[PDB]
Design a protein around this ligand. Sequence first.
Ligand code: CLA
Ligand code: CLA
Ligand SMILES: CCCCCCCCCCCCCCCC(=O)OC[C@H](CO[C@H]1O[C@H](CS(=O)(=O)O)[C@@H](O)[C@H](O)[C@H]1O)OC(=O)CCCCCCCCCCCCCCC
Ligand SMILES: CCCCCCCCCCCCCCCC(=O)OC[C@H](COP(=O)(O)OC[C@@H](O)CO)OC(=O)CCCCCCCCCCCCCCC
Ligand SMILES: CC1=C(/C=C/C(C)=C/C=C/C(C)=C/C=C/C=C(C)/C=C/C=C(C)/C=C/C2=C(C)CCCC2(C)C)C(C)(C)CCC1
Lengths: 96, 50
Amino acid sequence: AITKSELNQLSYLQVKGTGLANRCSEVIGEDTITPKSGARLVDMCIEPKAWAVEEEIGKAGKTEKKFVNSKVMTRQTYTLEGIEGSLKTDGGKIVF
Amino acid sequence: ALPWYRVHTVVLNDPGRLISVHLMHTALVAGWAGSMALYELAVFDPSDPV
Ligand code: CLA
Ligand code: CLA
Ligand SMILES: CCCCCCCCCCCCCCCC(=O)OC[C@H](CO[C@H]1O[C@H](CS(=O)(=O)O)[C@@H](O)[C@H](O)[C@H]1O)OC(=O)CCCCCCCCCCCCCCC
Ligand SMILES: CCCCCCCCCCCCCCCC(=O)OC[C@H](COP(=O)(O)OC[C@@H](O)CO)OC(=O)CCCCCCCCCCCCCCC
Ligand SMILES: CC1=C(/C=C/C(C)=C/C=C/C(C)=C/C=C/C=C(C)/C=C/C=C(C)/C=C/C2=C(C)CCCC2(C)C)C(C)(C)CCC1
């Protein structure tokens, strides 16, 4: 539904058509992890929620480069899924 | 019998057709307003209002 654990409790038949397949999951907590050695980020999901395009606009006797809002012309087909990478620590910082 | 500059005097004593002809001028005016607005909207550039 909202978290992965209870998303895995649903059928393909009772999810098809609703639009939940294009949504990203939600976490719950405030702990710390610290990746071990030789770890990999897996299942990463990225979901956009607002789009803007840079162009010229006019406020009052002036023009400036501003980001104007835009509406998506396609449908719920814009979220990335399944991204994987390899974590490592260079000098106390994590690299993806 | 009427000359060309007196043709539209046949409705002088006909209250029923005076309404009709005045309605016709009204319809023509309204149509002109609508069509002029439509034509103007197709050649207007709203990018720079300054
Ligand atoms: C008490 C009711 C009443 C009302 C509401 C009106 C209203 C009007 N009269 Mg009038 N009139 C009245 C009594 C009334 N009159 C009486 C007692 C007489 C003597 C018989 C006349 C004789 C008279 C003449 C000779 C003329 C008018 C015209 C007009 C119209 C001029 C403005 C116009 O065209 O707007 C533009 C119109 C609109 C924006 C549309 C408004 C919506 C309409 C009214 C809906 C129509 C539905 C309704 C069932 C039609 C019948 C009602 C009718 C009485 C208005 C205007 C709507 C003129 C006209 O018709 O020109 C076209 C005209 O030449 N009147
Ligand atoms: C307050 C606004 C107003 C008024 C008072 C009028 C008044 C009139 N309109 Mg109208 N009209 C208006 C707004 C108005 N209009 C608007 C906003 C539109 C939309 C663009 C029209 C479109 C329209 C059409 C399409 C027609 C009228 C016509 C008429 C006339 C019908 C009465 C008649 O028989 O006159 C008798 C006619 C005259 C007295 C001649 C008047 C001449 C005018 C004032 C100047 C001439 C124009 C220009 C100089 C061209 C001359 C060159 C020519 C010799 C080749 C009348 C004078 C009808 C008309 O004139 O046909 C006869 C007609 O067919 N009107
Ligand atoms: C029902 C409507 C009632 C009225 C409502 C309000 C009016 C509606 C719009 C009317 C526009 C007509 C004039 C256009 C402006 C113009 O002349 O200059 C613009 C261009 C300049 O020319 C050329 O020059 C230009 C530069 S170039 O060619 O590219 O070099 C180019 O841009 C252009 O395309 C090219 O044509 O003129 C023309 O070439 C257009 C030719 C006319 C267009 C068709 C007219 C339709 C009329 C038919 C009905 C007649 C009715 C008679 C009585 C019943
Ligand atoms: C969709 C719209 C398309 C149409 C739009 C409008 C069309 C309207 C056109 C009508 C105009 C026609 C008027 C002619 C009709 C015509 O003239 O008829 C002459 C006409 C005759 O009057 P009578 O009462 O004798 O009419 C007898 C009748 O049979 C006429 O119907 O007299 C007048 O109209 C008086 C005005 C004097 C007019 C003088 C005209 C001469 C002017 C100068 C000529 C140029 C000189 C050049 C050298 C310098
Ligand atoms: C029927 C119907 C309909 C339709 C309608 C329509 C389609 C309309 C149109 C209308 C129109 C579209 C109109 C138009 C008009 C126009 C006009 C009316 C014009 C006029 C002009 C003039 C008059 C001019 C003149 C001149 C010249 C030419 C030159 C210079 C000078 C002068 C300006 C004077 C509908 C569906 C809705 C509904 C149902 C019924």
